[PDB]
Amino acid sequence: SMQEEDTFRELRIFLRNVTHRLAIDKRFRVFTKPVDPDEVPDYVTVIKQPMDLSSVISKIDLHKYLTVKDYLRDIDLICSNALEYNPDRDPGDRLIRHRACALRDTAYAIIKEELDEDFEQLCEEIQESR
Ligand SMILES: Cc1cc2ccnc(N[C@@H]3CCNC[C@H]3OCC3CCS(=O)(=O)CC3)c2[nH]c1=O
To answer: Coiled-coil region(s) at which residues?
Structure first.
């Protein structure tokens, strides 16, 4: 219905705003675009589902997220990919891992403060009806 389409449009607006606020944070620059294979050639072989904030924006615009839970799965993926690919004790690896956890924590904190639980519940119930 028109009301359900209005609901998902509001969701997309909300998700674009959250994602933009993450994307403009200097700490998260490394997560804004896909990994360049010329810089990191074994990434594609090690990480089976690459995810980044530009891919998240594309997925929002392709109507791929019907709930905030589905969106947070991809944010969690950005984080888990970083922990998997950069597991070493070296400062480079430790920096990106800290940034990855910060990205995750920041996304969850924004959502905790600004997502209405009844709005998310509505999204989930519409999704479950399809
Ligand atoms: C998304 C991503 C991008 C990336 C780009 C370059 N190098 C990586 N990993 C290196 C693997 C071996 N040890 C050093 C690591 O690079 C650390 C470096 C810290 C600064 S940063 O801006 O977070 C880019 C990664 C990278 N690992 C990644 O997971």
So the answer is: 108-130
Q: Which two tokens stand for residue 8?
A: 């998902």
Question: Rounded to the nearest whole angstrom, what is the distance from the C-alpha of residue 46 to the centroid of ligand 1?
Answer: 13
Q: Specify burial of residue 43 (Cβ count, 10 A radius: 0-12, 13-18, 19+).
A: middle
Kindly list the protein residues whose Cβ atom lies closer than 6 A to any atom of ligand 1. 30, 35, 39-40, 82, 85-86, 90, 92-93, 95-96, 99
- Which residues are within 8 A (CB) of 108 and not within 5 positions of it... i.e. 6 or more apart? 72, 75
Q: How was this structure determined?
A: X-ray
Please report the resolution in angstroms: 1.9
CA 90 to ligand 1 center in whole angstroms: 11
Please tell me the distance from the alpha carbon of residue 121 to that of residue 97, in angstroms, as a whole number. Answer: 32
Structural domains present in the chain: 1-130 (1.20.920.10)
What is the position in ligand 1's atom list of the atom closest to the CA of 88? 13
Buried b (16+ CB within 10 A) or exposed e, 1-32: eeeeeebbeebbebbeebbeebbebeebebbb
